Enzyme design. Structure first.
Site, PDB file in Angstrom:
ATOM      1  CG  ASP A 290      -2.093  -1.016   1.020  1.00  0.00           C
ATOM      2  OD1 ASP A 290      -2.455  -1.314  -0.140  1.00  0.00           O
ATOM      3  OD2 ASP A 290      -2.631  -1.507   2.037  1.00  0.00           O
ATOM      4  CE1 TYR A 374      -6.694  -4.533   2.288  1.00  0.00           C
ATOM      5  CE2 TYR A 374      -5.478  -3.061   0.728  1.00  0.00           C
ATOM      6  CZ  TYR A 374      -5.868  -4.366   1.163  1.00  0.00           C
ATOM      7  OH  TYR A 374      -5.486  -5.524   0.530  1.00  0.00           O
TER       8      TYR A 374
END
Ligand SMILES: [Cu+2]
Ligand SMILES: [Cu+2]
Ligand code: NA
Ligand code: NA
Ligand code: NA
Ligand code: NA
Lengths: 620, 620
Positions: A290, A374
């Site tokens: 990420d 997320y």
């Protein structure tokens, strides 16, 4: 005037102009990363030179470039063409998020797969997922994204409730070609919705919660100067922001009497990876960096007063570059506030008759980012007693799949026919240490059990042992919760009043590290995640544990290559890299939106001060 | 009308009268423990019988007694004379705290030891320390305390700064005889003071802290009925108080729609021990069972609004008995309040466009106790999402010694000539489980790593395994942080909507357990502390992991004797006993008064609910 000040809109506009004038920012170019460089070691020259590092993508297929620019002097310092088959592809662009879905919508193989499932192509969302490096030779040197599909029944529907399993596609986003469409079979698309704002799912909202009012009638106890310099309860630091790492803390120091004592030169979360543990070929390639692949700073949320941050809040609004070099403000992207933190110290003495109570508090610096499904909150805490703590808060929507008839050893069932694959969320904290200055060393401290016998006749004694890590090749360490293992960062040239070296102790949560097989692609690309602690000698260009270009990089970059230099770290300028993470077996309670779970670490003084540093806290 | 209501002053006065009339409370008698008994299994009779258990000491040397009384019927149910050489001595009495110092002040051996050190006997404080069981045959069946000395330079001085090392005495507190005085040599008495309210030590107090105001303008969200029954945000429970255990939680349940679902029948900290790891004969006997030997509930502090508990506070004032059976109120001994707890759940969705944020909160039930140098806060937390958490906060003043010239492997130096011996603080939580009712079982859950190969060709898969604990002889378990080990308490007869048994997962902190040699006296007397988790079948008389009479008990009582019954625990009425603790190597920052350090555990729902239980929380 501080070299650690946040990037300004004017600086980003000047970078744009410098790149444009140098012929580096034509219509086919996109900025994939732009950030300010930290001052080099030896900034006691006062000769400011604000330099920016830029990664430039080319949408026509030309080689991308890495460029360094001086905004102070209006010059290009260096520009290098990148061979991406060798050194890795550039981070994913925000504008590529929609390209995967659009290219698949006209591919006959994709359409035939949707037709067999009676799915309207207009309702099918495709996630833009990083590709990694696996067996497909045609992908080397090409910019690939993979796509998994989810159905939206209507524009406000949560697509995550409706995964389309048995189907995956790979796309070359520069040539605009669908390289492979893989259909392993038809799974029912789970039909229950996951709309957590639908009254049919929430029921009537509670009317039982009464307000909690947190106010500071005299204002906060911290001051902000120069835009991003914080002073609070003897702490001093600068709050930076980078589009890849997010909030970065600089120059963490503590005013001990008349002296400002450094503790940490730079603190950041330098990588985070989400490996999935489902062996289905539809998902067995999934490992999302990420930070390194998507850049968590560019997706920071605007935080709302009263909802995201509660109390007397001071905001920072960092400026980043868009893909064309225009400045873009993240309004209210960083919250800063102090919080009551219960009892600090308390004693009622049977002999002196004195009753003593003091309260604790902490300074909070936080931001929240959203990457697809997320959402992560990043929190840094400074406490009155010298403790520094980091906490990650994981929420959002779990990544879903079908739940196979007959069950699974690698997927949890959340709803009828709806699964969630097992995965981890693993972080790397990069701590450029400066305990009382730059001459530091790391010791590993274990509890020592002692055998009953001579000198220990009642079998009660126990002790501790400390091992100095002297070279990088011996500084790759594992946790051992059973022996109470911690690590101490000390300064052998700076002693407390008892003539012991001053130090800070790192306390880990001792969660599992990377679970994948050591021969796997992800173990090679995320080698940092296989060990709890690494120590390197400081170097300007050793910034990330995974290297500079993580996307589609074949592996071994970053920390395993750095430590091969086997440099001296015994009383030197050193960097601690701490791996920590959550292992997530999703539960029914995680659906349809996940309550926060947390993980982190802390550092506490260990003979840094000559006595408790909070004797001068007043009695409320 | 509830059987779980707090003891009243009237109940204690009636117990006094019943004991007096029965001839059991003459002038030579002292009450060492008095507490209400919980209702027996099958309380669905509504026939209340409030029974109290009493331990009665005799200061003239007669045998002590255990007595059970019915206050409802005004009757003595049973009275048994105790053979203390067999079953253990009674807990330490508050009135014995001064007796050790007074008896030593007239003993010629003690006086000669003080004279050699030029110490005025009027300035020497002697700590009343529990004795344990060691090599001294003359102590069996005698009520012994040991004494260590500390100098007070003036009435408000902190004696802990001035330990008198090399000297220890043993006293028979009933016969009023000093049995042994041991003087191993003269150590300098450390001369620096430790007076944390002296301006010469604190310096000028900070003027930089601005107020934080926490108010609830509509009052709190919880209600208190029947004196001690709490309802808060779907939670329901009763708050009890016992002079040995302190705050006890009863009948923890959660209102899930129309059903009140039990989770925990009774939760308490049933023992806590502080073993010291210094092999010097002056201190190698030191192991303080703060709960079982001293009774932590009787030393609970009166908590001050604004200092100890901040916000909108509701107090309980529990009533206990003094040594003569008179009721005594601990004014404001328990604080209850709710606290904001940051973000509960958050998601900003790229496809639906919906931005969603909800805040968390917790209910706090706490008390603080002081035992000599130690002060401990006990905190129970209930969260909106179904999580239950316990936290212990350790503060006070560290127990000191001389620091030997030439150093020590078992003592930290705090100040010139002043040491602090290594030790642990180890707790036992007793969790009488009732997950959806009383048919429960425990499973141990480990992460499972998988080898790369057929069915796992990319080497990414990982899984988990669960092992049911079926008999008590296999239910003594150790932590394993590296394999992510947790324990699940489930109800095999109660399934969620996915047809899986409902459950709760226990998350431990995985700190070291008892470090002493397994052949030591303390390993036998604190056997519970050698393992992280024990499961027993419920039984009325199996209350404490160390047995009923811990003081001077020779060992093996409690959990090792209980589990020898090897009872069935697979889908039965079971009790979980969790060991957790702090290993304390004191640091300079712990002196002269220690900043709070913490340890605890938590339980989270694991398929207990059919989906997230906080979808009906409103948007602030
Ligand atoms: Cu997760
Ligand atoms: Cu301690
Ligand atoms: Na390569
Ligand atoms: Na450094
Ligand atoms: Na015995
Ligand atoms: Na039970």
């Amino acid at each position: 005037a501080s070299p650690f000040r946040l990037a300004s809109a004017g600086e980003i506009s000047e970078v744009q102009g410098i790149l444009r004038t140098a012929g580096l920012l034509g219509p086919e170019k996109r900025i994939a990363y732009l950030g300010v460089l930290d001052p080099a070691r030896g900034a006691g020259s006062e000769a400011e030179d604000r330099r920016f590092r830029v990664f430039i993508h080319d949408v026509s297929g030309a080689r991308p470039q890495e460029v360094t620019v001086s905004v102070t002097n209006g010059t290009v310092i260096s520009a290098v063409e990148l061979d991406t088959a060798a050194t890795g592809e550039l981070p994913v662009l925000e504008e590529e998020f929609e390209v995967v879905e659009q290219l698949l919508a006209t591919d006959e193989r994709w359409l035939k797969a949707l037709a067999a499932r009676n799915l309207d192509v207009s309702k099918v969302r495709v996630a833009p997922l990083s590709a990694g490096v696996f067996e497909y030779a045609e992908e080397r040197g090409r910019r690939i994204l993979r796509g998994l599909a989810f159905v939206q029944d209507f524009p406000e529907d949560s697509a995550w409730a409706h995964p389309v399993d048995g189907l995956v596609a790979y796309v070359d986003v520069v040539s605009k070609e669908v390289t492979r469409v893989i259909d392993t079979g038809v799974f029912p698309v789970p039909a229950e919705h996951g709309n957590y704002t639908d009254p049919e799912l929430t029921g009537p909202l509670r009317t039982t919660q009464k307000p909690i009012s947190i106010t500071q009638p005299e204002g906060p106890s911290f001051t902000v100067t120069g835009g991003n310099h914080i002073e609070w309860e003897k702490w001093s630091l600068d709050v930076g922001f980078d589009v890849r790492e997010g909030v970065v803390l600089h120059n963490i120091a503590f005013r001990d009497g008349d002296r400002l004592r450094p503790i940490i030169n730079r603190a950041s979360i330098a990588e985070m990876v989400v490996p999935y543990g489902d062996p289905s070929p539809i998902r067995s390639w999934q490992n999302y960096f990420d930070t390194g692949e998507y850049l968590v700073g560019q997706y920071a949320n605007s935080l709302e007063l009263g909802c995201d941050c509660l109390g007397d809040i001071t905001y920072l609004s960092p400026v980043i570059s868009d893909a064309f070099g225009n400045p873009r403000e993240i309004r209210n992207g960083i919250c800063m506030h102090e919080e009551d933190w219960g009892i600090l110290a308390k004693h009622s003495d049977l002999w002196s008759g004195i009753n003593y109570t003091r309260r604790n508090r902490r300074m909070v610096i936080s931001f929240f980012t959203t990457i697809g499904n997320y959402d992560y909150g990043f929190y840094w805490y400074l406490y009155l007693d010298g403790t520094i703590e980091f906490e990650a808060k994981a929420t959002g929507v779990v990544f879903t799949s079908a739940f196979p008839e007959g069950g699974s050893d690698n997927i949890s069932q959340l709803a009828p026919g709806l699964g969630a694959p097992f995965h981890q969320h693993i972080f790397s904290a990069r701590l450029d240490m400066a305990i009382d200055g730059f001459t530091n060393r790391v010791e590993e401290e274990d509890v020592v059990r002692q055998t009953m016998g001579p000198g220990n006749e009642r079998g009660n004694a126990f002790s501790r042992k400390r091992t100095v890590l002297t070279r990088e090749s011996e500084a790759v360490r594992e946790a051992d919760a059973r022996t109470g293992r911690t690590w101490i960062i000390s300064n052998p040239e700076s002693k407390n009043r008892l003539n012991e070296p001053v130090g800070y102790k790192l306390h880990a949560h001792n969660q599992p590290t990377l679970l994948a097989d050591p021969g796997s692609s992800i173990a090679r690309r995320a080698a940092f995640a296989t060990k709890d602690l690494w120590v390197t000698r400081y170097a300007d260009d050793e910034r990330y544990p995974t290297g500079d270009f993580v996307n589609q990089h074949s592996g071994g970059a970053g920390l395993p290559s750095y430590i091969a230099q086997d440099r001296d770290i015994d009383g030197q300028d050193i960097v601690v890299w701490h791996t920590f993470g959550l292992t997530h077996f999703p539960r029914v309670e995680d659906w349809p939106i996940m309550p926060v779970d947390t993980v982190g670490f802390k550092l506490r003084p260990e003979g840094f001060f000559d006595r408790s540093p909070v004797l001068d806290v007043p009695a409320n």
